[PDB]
Swiss-Prot record, chain A:
It is found in: Cytoplasm; Nucleus, Nucleolus. It comes from Schizosaccharomyces pombe (strain 972 / ATCC 24843) (Fission yeast). GO terms for cellular component: cytosol; cytosolic large ribosomal subunit; nucleolus. GO terms for molecular function: structural constituent of ribosome. This is Large ribosomal subunit protein eL29. GO terms for biological process: cytoplasmic translation.
UniProtKB/Swiss-Prot annotation, chain B:
The keyword Disulfide bond does not apply. The keyword Cytoplasm applies. GO terms for molecular function: structural constituent of ribosome. This is Large ribosomal subunit protein eL21A. The lineage of its organism: Eukaryota, Fungi, Dikarya, Ascomycota, Taphrinomycotina. The gene is rpl2101. There are 2 genes for eL21 in S.pombe. Component of the ribosome, a large ribonucleoprotein complex responsible for the synthesis of proteins in the cell. The small ribosomal subunit (SSU) binds messenger RNAs (mRNAs) and translates the encoded message by selecting cognate aminoacyl-transfer RNA (tRNA) molecules. The large subunit (LSU) contains the ribosomal catalytic site termed the peptidyl transferase center (PTC), which catalyzes the formation of peptide bonds, thereby polymerizing the amino acids delivered by tRNAs into a polypeptide chain. It comes from Schizosaccharomyces pombe (strain 972 / ATCC 24843) (Fission yeast). Disulfide bonds: none annotated. Keywords: Cytoplasm, Ribonucleoprotein, Ribosomal protein.
UniProtKB/Swiss-Prot annotation, chain C:
It is found in: Cytoplasm; Nucleus. It comes from Schizosaccharomyces pombe (strain 972 / ATCC 24843) (Fission yeast). This is Large ribosomal subunit protein uL5A. It holds the Pfam family Ribosomal_L5_C. Component of the ribosome, a large ribonucleoprotein complex responsible for the synthesis of proteins in the cell. The small ribosomal subunit (SSU) binds messenger RNAs (mRNAs) and translates the encoded message by selecting cognate aminoacyl-transfer RNA (tRNA) molecules. The large subunit (LSU) contains the ribosomal catalytic site termed the peptidyl transferase center (PTC), which catalyzes the formation of peptide bonds, thereby polymerizing the amino acids delivered by tRNAs into a polypeptide chain. GO terms for cellular component: cytosol; cytosolic large ribosomal subunit; cytosolic small ribosomal subunit; nucleus. Belongs to the universal ribosomal protein uL5 family. Keywords: Cytoplasm, Nucleus, Ribonucleoprotein, Ribosomal protein, RNA-binding, rRNA-binding.
Curated annotation (Swiss-Prot), chain D:
It is found in: Cytoplasm. It holds the Pfam family Ribosomal_L16. Belongs to the universal ribosomal protein uL16 family. This is Large ribosomal subunit protein uL16A. Component of the large ribosomal subunit (LSU). Mature yeast ribosomes consist of a small (40S) and a large (60S) subunit. The 40S small subunit contains 1 molecule of ribosomal RNA (18S rRNA) and at least 33 different proteins. The large 60S subunit contains 3 rRNA molecules (25S, 5.8S and 5S rRNA) and at least 46 different proteins. InterPro entries: Ribosomal_uL16, Ribosomal_uL16_CS_euk_arc, Ribosomal_uL16_dom, Ribosomal_uL16_euk_arch, Ribosomal_uL16_sf. GO terms for cellular component: cytosol; cytosolic large ribosomal subunit.
Length: 56, 159, 169, 168, 284
RNA sequence: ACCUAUUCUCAAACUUUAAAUAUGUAAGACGCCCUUGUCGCUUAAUUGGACGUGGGCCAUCGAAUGAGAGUU
RNA sequence: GAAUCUCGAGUAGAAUAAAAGGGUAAAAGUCCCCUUGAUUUUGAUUUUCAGUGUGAAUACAAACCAUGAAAGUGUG
RNA sequence: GUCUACGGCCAUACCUAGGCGAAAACACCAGUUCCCGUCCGAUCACUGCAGUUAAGCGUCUGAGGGCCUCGUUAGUACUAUGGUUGGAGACAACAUGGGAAUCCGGGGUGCUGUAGGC
């Protein structure tokens, strides 16, 4: 019972596939103080862009 | 049979260097780490708080979170047939900047510079590194360097 | 021409009474040190338990006091009358300090008390030069140079000149 | 368990250096294990033959194999080219020393070879180099060995030990 | 043999400053370690050191290359503003702390916003922030190796800097006159120490009791004939002169002349040829 | 019985030192430079920080080679 | 060298509850002073892993506090 | 150039014997009113400058111990790949690559950042 002979061959059969890399990650895993700040900054940035678009 | 403790078989990995024991250098705390920075994990045995697992010693990853006294590092760990993202909260005592990323950044600065003067002069600039080319043809002068003839030496008994 | 500030001076005189036992006798010895020194003695406890002396660890067994300054010089002189200004060359340690023990204390001007009894104790004179703060201070502590350290012969000579005493070889 | 061999130096072990210039080595040619018991037997054989032929004071025999590896008993792990025995003698006892080691080859397993060393006795210098340095005074005997001059150390600490040394 | 070659080979030396006994890295770590999520925000430290005759008060930021000084003042600058004597006492520490605070705020740009306590009455106060303005310049004290006992000159420098407009978080547990039993601060005693009354009391009692100690212990004061009672007004005038003009003046010293003077006295190291010449000349 | 300079010979749980082979990452357009906005976080402070805006350089686009690739 | 304490050296050769290894010298060691961060509430990670559970652990966040002149440290 | 404060790397900086140090600075130092702590102001705390470079400190010397580099060891030990290679085995050689360590000898005995003082 137990051996590791075939497992590496079985592993590379379908490659050692990397996880998909996305542009934005979740603001989870981040500091709660930082995360709530970024909400307020992003909320104001969205408002600022919309007002600038409306006035231009 | 094994014992599967967190610090098992870390006798030599977490050991302090010879004549490098004692107080930790203070410059470690004065370096700023930002998200996206490349850092090399090297566990310091003196600080037993915030230690990563013995797998992450010698691994390099990208910082994703910066905390009061710690850094969040993103490592990819081989689990069977895939890569898994491992997010290790490791204190800055066990973290150092990767000189490779610096060197890349300085090379990027140089490449942008060479591109600027190339466009200013109207010429094209070679920016891609090349592997070492085969040796070129060159002359070798024997003046005051007359070749000496060598013969293999006979066997001798010298213990 | 010798620099005047390296003149040898007395640092401290330590009076130690070790009876090998605890209780009222040690307390009375503490009072004796109180009258002799005018200072509160400190009780020395046992580091280890020894059966041959009947000593158990952590028991207050001894009382010691440290006198420094002019009072130390006077008490040292008082002991020198008892010793008749005679000390063997063996009495001087290589560091530069010396000492002597006195069995009987009533001759030191202490009134005899039958309830107190007779206690034997050790004088110990520690010798220094002006500049020992360099080794005894916290900030910028350092090692005293070899040329400034004190030898047994240096202490012997200083003792002989100051007190006109004879040191047996 | 106690090793069967306890004495590793035999003969005139207190002899100097200059009177015994010749050195002959019995070296193992094969990577093998040699039991302590076999080492003791060869030691007895070599000592008996050398004393019988050349006498007690005409040789110094040193066993360089030490049985530290354990297998009940101990064996001496030897490599290719590792010296097993070394005999230092005068130039006249060359045949006696060679015959003594050749007979003791039969007590050892594997292949053993007899080589006359180019070094002076048990020293690390060749015979010509040792003679030159002895003449120049950088070598002073000390019991069964000799102290050699070295550049390091205090000048007084080396001059008092080597008084007749002629520094250039 | 107690010190052998293996002993020296295995010997690991402490840091240079720890060998010299000048810094405590255990306290330095916690003083200079800035939070990593604050990135490049510097952590300013009020380093206060005392010699046998002078006070050195500095404001220091920590960097990888080394420590940088933002503002500085030396107690030898007090005679410029009036204080000539007791350049290392509690009052001098207060004055230097006030001078450092004024210089730092002038460099920062907060002198006109945070004047601090113009007239020190001994009350324990902290520099409150402006509601719609910049917060006070935050500095943390560094005592070094001096013990933190009540009535220390280090806390005197802290009090001077705090009154100068800097924000140094602290408690009155170390200010002179603080009673441990009642947990109260004696403002009268603190004002007395601020104005140097603890020296005036020393002078008058010495005159009353043992004048022989007086002429030699207070020789500097007696040389100019200044008695105890006007110390308070002298210090008050010194504080006013410090506040009106806190600028630091550089001495017109001739650095090149000092270089020429010292190069004569510095010893030049012998080369290899000189070493071997001295070598064989002694062997012969 | 030591101490000093030596000397003979060893170590799986001894070691100052320390390979070979295997091993982590980087080698850019999610790039670079400049300008500029948001925030309740952060700083002594539009100071930072993070996300942005508007521009500018622009497939020798920043090593060699080879393949289309990935996920349910 | 004095009828236990005294100063010279002292790279840790001692201690750190318990096995063993790692870590530690103006300390993590030995004394002293004040203390209950051995507390409440989240989520996020690490290890053994199926990245299920359990156990142990790490870095935060919102409170409430201890301590210290303070920086800061503390969720056994 | 020298000194002080704060440091960075943390012995080329450490340990030891000896010889120097002009200025300033630093240190030794006098005292115990007070703040403060001890058996003892000796340590720590506070006030001051009467003398001193004796020590700390800086510097020099020693074919000093040590430490750091360069070479010797050495293409040696070892090792990745290869053979229907040798050898009973042990092991060894060869082909294509990587390549140390001690001993030994030469050199070296801190450099440097900010703010100042002479």
């Amino acid at each position: 019972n137990h051996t590791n002979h075939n497992q590496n061959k079985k592993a590379h059969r379908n490659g050692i596939k990397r996880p998909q890399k996305h542009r934005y990650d979740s603001l989870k895993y981040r500091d709660a103080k930082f995360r709530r700040n970024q909400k307020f900054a992003n909320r104001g940035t969205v408002e600022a862009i919309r007002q600038a678009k409306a006035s231009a | 049979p094994h014992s599967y403790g967190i610090r098992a078989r870390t006798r030599y990995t977490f050991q302090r260097g010879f004549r490098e024991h004692g107080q930790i250098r203070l410059s470690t705390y004065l370096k700023t780490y930002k998200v996206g920075d490349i850092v090399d994990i090297k566990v310091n045995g003196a600080v037993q708080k915030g230690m990563p697992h013995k797998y992450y010693h010698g691994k390099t990853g990208v910082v994703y979170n910066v905390t009061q006294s710690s850094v969040g590092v993103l490592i990819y760990k081989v689990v069977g047939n895939r890569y898994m993202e491992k997010r290790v909260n490791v204190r800055i005592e066990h973290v150092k900047h990767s000189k490779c990323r610096q060197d890349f950044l300085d090379r990027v600065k140089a490449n942008e510079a060479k591109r600027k003067e190339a466009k200013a002069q109207g010429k094209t600039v070679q920016l891609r590194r090349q592997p070492a080319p085969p040796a070129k043809a060159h002359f070798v002068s024997t003046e005051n360097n007359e070749p000496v003839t060598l013969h293999p030496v006979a066997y001798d008994t010298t213990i | 021409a010798q620099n005047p500030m390296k003149e040898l001076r007395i640092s401290k005189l330590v009076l130690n009474i070790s009876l090998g036992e605890s209780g009222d006798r040690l307390t009375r010895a503490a009072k004796v040190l109180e009258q002799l020194s005018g200072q509160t003695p400190v009780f020395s406890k046992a580091r280890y338990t020894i059966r041959r002396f009947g000593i158990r660890r952590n028991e207050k067994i001894a009382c010691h006091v440290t006198v420094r300054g002019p009072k130390a010089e006077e008490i040292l002189e008082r002991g020198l009358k008892v010793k008749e200004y005679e000390l063997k060359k063996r009495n001087f340690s290589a560091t530069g300090n010396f000492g002597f023990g006195i069995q009987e204390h009533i001759d030191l001007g202490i009134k005899y008390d039958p309830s107190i009894g007779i206690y034997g104790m050790d004088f110990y004179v520690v010798m220094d030069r002006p500049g020992m703060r360099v080794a005894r201070r916290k900030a910028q502590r350092g090692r005293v140079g070899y040329t400034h350290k004190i030898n047994a012969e240096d202490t012997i000579n200083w003792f002989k000149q100051k007190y006109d005493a004879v040191v047996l070889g | 368990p106690d090793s069967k061999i306890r004495i590793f130096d035999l003969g005139r072990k207190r002899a100097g250096v200059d009177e015994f210039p010749l050195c002959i080595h019995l070296v193992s040619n094969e990577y093998e294990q040699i039991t302590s018991e076999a080492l003791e037997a060869a030691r007895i054989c070599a000592n008996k033959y050398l004393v019988k032929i050349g006498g007690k004071d005409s040789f110094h025999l040193r066993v360089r194999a030490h049985p530290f590896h354990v297998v009940n008993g101990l064996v001496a792990r030897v490599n290719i080219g590792q010296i097993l025995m070394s005999v230092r003698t005068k130039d006249s006892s060359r045949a006696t020393a060679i015959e003594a080691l050749r007979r003791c080859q039969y007590k050892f397993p594997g292949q053993q070879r007899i080589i006359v060393s180019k070094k002076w006795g048990f020293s690390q210098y060749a015979r010509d180099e040792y003679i030159e340095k002895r003449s120049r005074g950088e070598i002073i005997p000390d019991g069964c060995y000799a102290k050699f001059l070295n550049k390091r150390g205090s000048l007084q600490e080396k001059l008092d030990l080597f008084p007749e040394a002629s520094f250039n | 043999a107690v010190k052998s070659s293996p002993y020296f080979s295995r010997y690991q030396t402490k840091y240079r400053r720890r060998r010299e006994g000048k810094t405590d890295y255990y306290a330095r770590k916690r003083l200079i370690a800035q939070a990593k999520n604050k990135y490049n925000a510097p952590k300013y430290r009020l380093v206060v050191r005392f010699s046998n005759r002078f006070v050195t008060c500095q404001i220091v930021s920590s960097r990888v290359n080394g420590d940088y000084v933002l503002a500085h003042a030396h107690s030898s600058e007090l005679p410029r503003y009036g204080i000539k004597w007791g350049l290392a006492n509690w009052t001098a520490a207060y004055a230097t702390g006030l001078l450092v605070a004024r210089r730092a705020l002038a460099k920062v740009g907060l002198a006109d916003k945070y004047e601090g306590v113009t007239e020190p009455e001994g009350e324990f106060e902290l520099t409150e922030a402006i509601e719609d303005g910049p917060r006070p310049f935050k500095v943390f004290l560094d005592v070094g190796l001096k013990r933190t006992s009540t009535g220390s000159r280090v806390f005197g420098a802290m009090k001077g800097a705090s009154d100068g407009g800097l924000f140094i978080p602290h408690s009155p547990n170390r200010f002179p006159g603080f009673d441990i039993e009642t947990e109260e601060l004696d403002d009268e005693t603190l004002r007395k120490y601020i104005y140097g009354g603890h020296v005036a009391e020393y002078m008058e009692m010495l005159i009353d009791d043992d004048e022989e100690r007086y002429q030699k212990q207070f020789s500097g004061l007696i040389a100019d004939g200044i008695e105890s009672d006007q110390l308070e007004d002298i210090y008050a005038e010194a504080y006013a002169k410090i506040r009106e003009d806190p600028s630091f003046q550089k001495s017109g010293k001739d650095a090149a002349a000092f270089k020429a003077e010292s190069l004569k006295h510095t010893q030049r190291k012998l080369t290899a040829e000189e070493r071997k010449e001295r070598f064989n000349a002694k062997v012969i």
